[PDB]
Paper text:
Plasma [name] (pGSN) is the most abundant actin regulating protein in our plasma, and it’s major function is to scavenge F-actin released from the damaged or dying cells, thereby protecting microvasculature of our circulatory system. Bonsai [name] or fragment 28–161 of [name] represents a single domain of [name] family of proteins with slight tail or portion of g1-g2 linker of [name] which allows it to bind actin. For this step, extension of the tail is necessary which is achieved upon binding to Ca2+ ions or exposure to low pH. Detailed analysis brought forth that 28–161 has an inherent tendency to self-associate at temperatures around 30–45 °C and the association behavior is influenced by Ca2+ ions present in the buffer.
Numbering used by the authors: 29 to 150
Write the structure that this text describes.
Amino acid sequence: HPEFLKAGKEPGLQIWRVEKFDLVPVPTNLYGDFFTGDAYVILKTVQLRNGNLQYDLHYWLGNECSQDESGAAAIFTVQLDDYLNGRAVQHREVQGFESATFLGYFKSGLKYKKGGVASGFK
Ligand SMILES: [Ca+2]
Ligand SMILES: [Ca+2]
């Protein structure tokens, strides 16, 4: 797991996955890929015209995702928003019910994969 120190410094996208009650950053090569069995936090840092940073926080919930994965993502989201002074706008993304905002981040492939890390409860 990574802290919030490496978060919203630079424009771009950061994606962690919930993995046994724990944020694990996603490899860049797998950005745009989501397991239907897992839950995710996504941070959109966009640079404004006046040079200031805008933040859009999305937790994303796989359709086959456990209640701990689900619950952890929503928690981290708040905790990280609080960290960024509550400057982020929070969105709940449910697989197959995502905002046009969230889908706009993924012009090429938004590719759903089957499976995912198992719940914390073994
Ligand atoms: Ca899972
Ligand atoms: Ca906020």
